[PDB]
Nucleic acid binder design. Sequence first.
RNA 1: GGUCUCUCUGGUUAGACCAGAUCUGAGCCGAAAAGCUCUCUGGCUAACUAGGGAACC
Length: 17
Amino acid sequence: GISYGRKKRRQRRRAHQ
RNA sequence: GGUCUCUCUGGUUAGACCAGAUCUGAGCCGAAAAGCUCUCUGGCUAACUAGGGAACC
């Protein structure tokens, strides 16, 4: 998860339930 | 003439490597902000291998 893009995906994934 | 020493190309395998994918790939954890592990695709890096070239004897 060190990559900034995964943080975006992790946040996007959390936002969609 | 011999030799993978270097280098490039193809291939195989791997990788606490770089990107992207649940704006619809999956699991784990927390009360939560978050965190952890994967899978798929492109690339990179390393090992090994064949071949071209170079280098050395």
